[PDB]
Design a binder for this molecule. Sequence first.
Ligand SMILES: Cc1nnc(CNCCN2C(=O)c3cccc4c(N(C)C)ccc(c34)C2=O)s1
Ligand SMILES: *[C@@H]1O[C@H](CO)[C@@H](O)[C@H](O)[C@H]1NC(C)=O
Ligand SMILES: *[C@@H]1O[C@H](CO)[C@@H](O)[C@H](O)[C@H]1NC(C)=O
Length: 572
Amino acid sequence: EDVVWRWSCDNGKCVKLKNDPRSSEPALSLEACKMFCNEYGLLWPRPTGEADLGNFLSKINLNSIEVKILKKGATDDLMEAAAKRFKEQVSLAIPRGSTPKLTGKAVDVYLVNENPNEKAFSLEMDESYGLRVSPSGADRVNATITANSFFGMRHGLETLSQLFVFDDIRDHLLMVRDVNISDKPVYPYRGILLDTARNYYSIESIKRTIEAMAAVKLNTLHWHITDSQSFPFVTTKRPNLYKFGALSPQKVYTKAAIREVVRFGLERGVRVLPEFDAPAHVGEGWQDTDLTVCFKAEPWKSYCVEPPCGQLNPTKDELYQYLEDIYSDMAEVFDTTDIFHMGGDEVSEACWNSSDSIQNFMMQNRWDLDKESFLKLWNYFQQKAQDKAYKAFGKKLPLILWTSTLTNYKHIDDYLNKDDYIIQVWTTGVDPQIKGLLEKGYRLIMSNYDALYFDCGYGAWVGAGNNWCSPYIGWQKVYDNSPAVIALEHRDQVLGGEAALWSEQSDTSTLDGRLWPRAAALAERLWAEPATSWQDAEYRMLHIRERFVRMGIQAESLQPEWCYQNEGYCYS
Ligand SMILES: Cc1nnc(CNCCN2C(=O)c3cccc4c(N(C)C)ccc(c34)C2=O)s1
Ligand SMILES: *[C@@H]1O[C@H](CO)[C@@H](O)[C@H](O)[C@H]1NC(C)=O
Ligand SMILES: *[C@@H]1O[C@H](CO)[C@@H](O)[C@H](O)[C@H]1NC(C)=O
């Protein structure tokens, strides 16, 4: 049948009213009301600069949208691909099984990339853009996106597509008539960590994830591609690692597959950043090399944080030949990344100390066998691995390490320096280490576990009860978690943040629900750093969830759809 309700704006809320026939006032459909009732309409993330959406909608012919690239250059391929995707983006405004009447104005989209040769990812990259929409002549619309680079341009196309609304009362595709928007992200690193070693993720699901990231302007996929449970990365130089280490022959990531993902990311402004976690979090794949110790050591609680145990043996020279080859194979296919993540989480002194070969090595260089001595062994390892990584990428590039015993701010400079190492933080946002590190000049990526660990909340995977970092983190808490507040005066040293999806209890099947729409909360926090709280973003968050579902993402459900249709009635 037909929609029988209409909506009217009342104190910032769209209230549902019967669409009575005896009225001379044109009915508003739900999302048409929302577009103007809400401070930022249906935008997500909201812009950081000018956000003028005017007051009117114009009817649009879906088949009369033309994108024109005004400046050519090295990014022609990327700009043309982005332009061709625009119609599909617009169509996301239209619910499945609905069709817009093909009437209304034609839309001219003009893309102006002021530096059409720039296509490298970097922390200094320019992601800003300007967006203007105005009527052109009597029967056309002029949308002009001006940006310093392809990446800013691509963000502009994303925002522009959000300015379309489907009127399901009249079956009209509508667009905001008068728009002036200027926009740029507060932080340059806006990421999602995907662990694909604790469980395998189909490359289809990885690309889908990238699609959703780009929809909310996240720009970094951190691919935690190995761990102790499996080695799915296909290293051509050390093929036994993936042959022995993969969960199955089909559960690998070939060079061809990785190149696909990396290119897919590039087209969508997403840096694909590989991680090789070391010297802990290794195991499967390394059998018969004699380059690990404690693999599957029992009882596991005595040797590691979670089973199976396993750590590299830094005392074996051959290890660094393996490492050099792995890093080199990674550099070959992950060839858009400007940064390399080297893990460095959770090293077990007990594990290293159960090894005879290791104990001899530490005696021979006159270190003892107490906790502080193994820090020296770890330092020895990281220095040699670091040198191999530089050689693999053919240049010095920033390296990332997790917060750990090694990166304790009190002695971190004994081991590292702030120019070469970025620290990924998974402590709570009030942990003293953060202030300590910032005072030493270190740059941080925020992944604080009390707000950014998306795996928390489910059943235990060892024994019973719930998993270690329960309770489940609602989007409200993700949204309110502010790096600016965490860092204070040292804000600029924060490169951004990253939602962590560890995969002990997640795989291809759960990935859409784990990430969405919660990662959108992080997307806005990192893009805009709003002074306002989640309550002020609530209505737009409910809409972005529906947009994800329309994209084919099996996003988590936040509230009854009744609440979405009846703003203001669901509160506490
Ligand atoms: C980087 C990494 N991110 N996540 C990783 C998984 N290993 C997590 C280990 N772990 C736990 O298993 C764990 C269990 C029970 C309580 C706690 C805890 N509290 C609330 C006292 C603080 C930190 C951890 C923890 C903690 O770090 S490595
Ligand atoms: C389209 O609008 C832009 C944005 O203001 C304006 O600069 C440009 O000249 C217009 N182009 C046309 C064809 O009107
Ligand atoms: C390592 O083991 C030796 C005993 O073989 C012990 O003396 C030393 O205390 C241990 N070190 C640590 C940190 O456990």
